[PDB]
Design a binder for these strands. Structure first.
Ligand SMILES: [Zn+2]
Lengths: 165, 619
DNA sequence: CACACACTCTCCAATTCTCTAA
DNA sequence: TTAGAGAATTGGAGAGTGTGTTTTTTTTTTTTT
């Protein structure tokens, strides 16, 4: 009863946006449609970012420790306790937000129609949006889903598709 | 003398326990004189057992419940004596094949497989689990029959805890070692081993499941099949195992099993129905009502649901060799509602099957021969098409099957039989099955430019056997998509008062279909005959003019099937022009969907051949 | 190898036959 | 007429002898790929 975090590579060579996703990865839509977010983790040469990455890795090598990033992330145990505290909640979506969820879903659908040759979407898209918004509600530790949760779920899906395109 | 008895090392008086259980039977009344009703039910039905609830025993008398749980091996025979004494004090001349068995049970599990301990040995327990295997019927000897091989004098010996007191000498004569066990004059009772896994819902996180052995006897043997989920009440036994079969040394670590006292299945889910169905059949637009009742959980495709309804009802089987079965094919992208339709109607129909055309399927479409692993003997596993010999066979991923399976399905659809040429075995199995198929495009999503056959890439010969073919394409239309989205959010906000209503609708749909199949046998009227005849000629007209061909005689057979099925739906028992018109309408709608070339419209030879007329002139 | 089963032979004494007295 | 003491036969306890045991990989071949 587990969530799958998959990482694929293209069948041959580098990724190529000229081709379709199933042509790039050589894995059928029966697999690809089960997922909720499809992300393209791109990598281009970029001089200053490469310099910083190399400085980071060289510090890791010569000191056996992460460099000072001048940010204080939460410790791993605190993150674990937080996620347990935030997933203990079981929010519910209010019925007044059904119309807004409908509007967001249909406009995303119709943008796919109008601008990207009706690329594949279905009712599981709406179900995935609702699951993402409820996960956001759990994360915010509020037992009612809201406009901001729906907006951020829609935004997350749209930016994942933007990474693909 | 019974009053002197106490259970060994227990200080409980058997006679007092018997009296307490007798007054329990006589005076317990409130599950909302209870068990005398069960005794009367035994008296009229003729089944020698009584089910009793341990919670009722507990609420009536806590001490009696404690005695039952702690010392079942003595207390349960005491309860048998009590119930038989009451039953034959009443009903004085009723005859039973056996004395009644009391079968105490707890409504829910008292323990789980992981927490069973040596403290629980020879104690009554209840556990939940899933059945993994069930052995063949084992005969257990109950009384040994001996005969003297010198003088044919016979004697009978009773079984002492699993061993025989063999007579060393004969009584009539006096020869030594002359008494021989006559196996088939001895007396036997049924026994069976069952291997039971802890439930998936009961396993701890990420652990491999635990398993126990149950032993059932007499009438509880043949009540449980593999895959069932049961709450089994029984006595937790511990027995020794000998180190090797020819030596009586035993391992210090004992084997354990459960002597089954009671089974309760926990995954199972007439005139009062006929009276409803008779008037509901003559209610107006009952056809539409049933078709809309099919698969409420998906947004509506009217002609697909109508075709599946007529497939469920089927034509009339008569004799010559013409199939009453109706074959339906669904096409569309992955992510459409076709698989939901398949799984729904598989859950609905009797004698149904659901499997994948892919070679990785759980149960195959074709028949095969295999070594039964728990026995090593050969078994002929007839495939799903043969198992669904009077039902619907749902085939998901129908495009992905290999050419041998395509040949098997061609054979089954044409001839309604499956040939067996296995090593040694030669036979003609029966496969009068209605195939409901769900295909996919070979590409990722449906190509609008290419035809149905060109997209799914199945042979035209096999495509020509299907009576109806439909498509689940969704328009790029707000008028459809907005209301679909409203239906989806409403489906999220589904509640139990709608679930019960839809379950009732599905249940009366099941009863309707079963009652139709039970007796209703349509025949053709003269007007219906004329309508079908002129329908075939009319379908031939549009193509025969201009020199092409637009129909062929097997489509008349399909129309006959659909008309008979529609008469079956409306309970007419006489096929009429109403049924024939509906058959023509639905068949032409299926053709409008499936046989439409994007350029020249509906082309009939796209089913008779690969490609179409335009392609044949393009090359 | 060595520790349980499986089988035969021998001796010991307990029962029945024979002859006598109560 | 019963039964009890001495002699012979049969039952069986037990001493002695002999028998049986404690999934895996590479390669081929036909059919199907
Ligand atoms: Zn004899």
């Amino acid at each position: 009863r587990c969530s799958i975090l998959a990482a694929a590579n293209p069948a041959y060579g580098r990724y190529n946006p000229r081709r379709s996703l199933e042509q790039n990865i050589q894995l059928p839509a029966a697999l690809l449609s089960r997922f909720d977010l499809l992300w393209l983790i791109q990598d281009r040469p970029d001089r200053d970012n490469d310099l910083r990455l190399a400085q980071h890795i060289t510090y890791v090598h010569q000191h056996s420790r992460q460099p000072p990033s001048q940010f204080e992330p939460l410790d791993m145990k605190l993150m674990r306790r937080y996620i347990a505290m935030c997933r203990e909640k079981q929010p519910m979506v209010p019925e007044s937000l059904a119309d807004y969820i409908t509007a967001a879903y249909v406009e995303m659908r119709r943008e796919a129609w109008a601008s990207k040759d009706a690329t594949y979407t279905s009712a599981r898209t709406l179900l995935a949006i609702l699951r993402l918004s409820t996960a956001l509600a759990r994360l915010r530790m509020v037992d009612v889903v809201e406009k901001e949760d729906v907006n951020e779920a829609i935004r997350l899906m749209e930016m994942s598709k933007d990474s693909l395109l | 003398l019974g009053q002197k008895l106490v259970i060994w090392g227990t200080d409980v008086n058997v006679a007092a326990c018997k009296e307490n259980f007798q007054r329990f039977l006589q005076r317990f009344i409130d599950p909302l004189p209870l068990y005398m009703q069960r005794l009367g039910e035994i008296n009229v039905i003729g089944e020698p057992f009584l089910n009793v609830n341990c919670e009722h025993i507990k609420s009536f008398d806590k001490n009696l419940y404690r005695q039952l749980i702690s010392y079942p091996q003595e207390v349960i025979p005491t309860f048998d004596m009590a119930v038989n004494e009451i039953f034959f004090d009443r009903y004085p001349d009723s005859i039973l094949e056996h004395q009644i068995q009391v079968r105490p049970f707890n409504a829910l599990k008292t323990k789980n497989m992981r927490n069973l301990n040596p403290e629980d040995i020879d104690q009554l327990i209840t556990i939940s689990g899933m059945v993994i295997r069930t052995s063949q019927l084992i005969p257990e000897m109950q009384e040994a029959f001996f005969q003297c091989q010198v003088c044919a004098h016979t004697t009978r010996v009773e079984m002492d805890r699993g061993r025989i007191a063999e007579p060393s000498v004969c009584g009539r004569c006096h020869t030594t070692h002359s008494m021989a066990l006559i196996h088939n004059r001895s007396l036997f009772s049924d026994k069976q081993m069952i291997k039971l896994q802890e439930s998936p819902e009961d396993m701890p996180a990420g652990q491999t499941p635990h398993t126990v052995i149950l032993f059932a006897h007499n009438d509880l043997v043949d009540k449980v099949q593999p895959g069932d989920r049961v709450n089994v009440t029984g006595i937790y036994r511990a027995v020794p195992i000998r180190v090797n079969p020819r030596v009586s040394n035993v391992k210090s670590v004992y084997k354990t099993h459960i002597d089954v006292i009671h089974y309760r299945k926990t995954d199972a889910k007439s005139e009062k129905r006929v009276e409803l169905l008779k008037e509901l059949s003559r209610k107006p637009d009952i056809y539409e009502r049933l078709a809309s009742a099919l698969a409420p959980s998906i947004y509506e495709h009217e002609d697909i649901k109508k075709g599946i309804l007529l497939q469920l009802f089927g034509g009339t089987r008569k004799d010559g060799k013409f199939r009453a079965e109706i074959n339906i094919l669904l096409c569309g992208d992955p992510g459409t509602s076709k698989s939901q339709l398949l799984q729904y109607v598989y859950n609905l129909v009797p004698r149904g099957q659901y499997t994948s055309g892919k070679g990785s399927s759980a149960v195959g479409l074709t028949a095969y021969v295999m070594k039964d692993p728990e026995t090593r003997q050969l078994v002929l596993q007839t495939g799903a098409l043969v198992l669904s010999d009077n039902g619907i066979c749902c085939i998901d991923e129908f495009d992905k099957m290999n050419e041998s399976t395509r040949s098997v399905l061609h054979e089954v659809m044409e001839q309604q039989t499956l040939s067996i040429a296995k090593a040694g075995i030669i036979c003609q199995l029966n496969a009068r099955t209605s195939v409901l198929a769900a295909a996919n495009p070979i590409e990722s999503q449906w190509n609008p430019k290419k035809t149905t056959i060109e997209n799914i890439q199945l042979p035209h010969t096999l495509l020509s056997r299907f009576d109806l073919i439909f498509l689940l394409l969704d328009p790029q239309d707000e008028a459809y998509d907005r209301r679909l989205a409203h239906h989806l959010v409403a489906l999220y906000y589904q509640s139990e008062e709608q679930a019960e209503e839809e379950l009732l609708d599905m249940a009366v749909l099941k009863d309707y279909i079963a009652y139709a199949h039970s007796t209703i046998m349509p025949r053709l009227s003269e007007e219906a005959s004329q309508a079908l005849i002129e329908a075939y000629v009319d379908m031939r007209k549009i193509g025969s003019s201009r020199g092409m061909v637009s129909a062929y005689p097997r489509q008349l057979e399909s129309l006959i099937r659909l008309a008979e099925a529609h008469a079956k739906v409306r309970l007419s028992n006489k096929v009429e022009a109403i049924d024939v018109e509906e058959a023509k309408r639905l068949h032409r709608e299926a053709l409008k969907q499936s046989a439409t070339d994007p350029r020249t419209g509906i082309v009939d030879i796209s089913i008779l051949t690969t490609g179409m007329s335009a392609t044949s002139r393009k090359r």
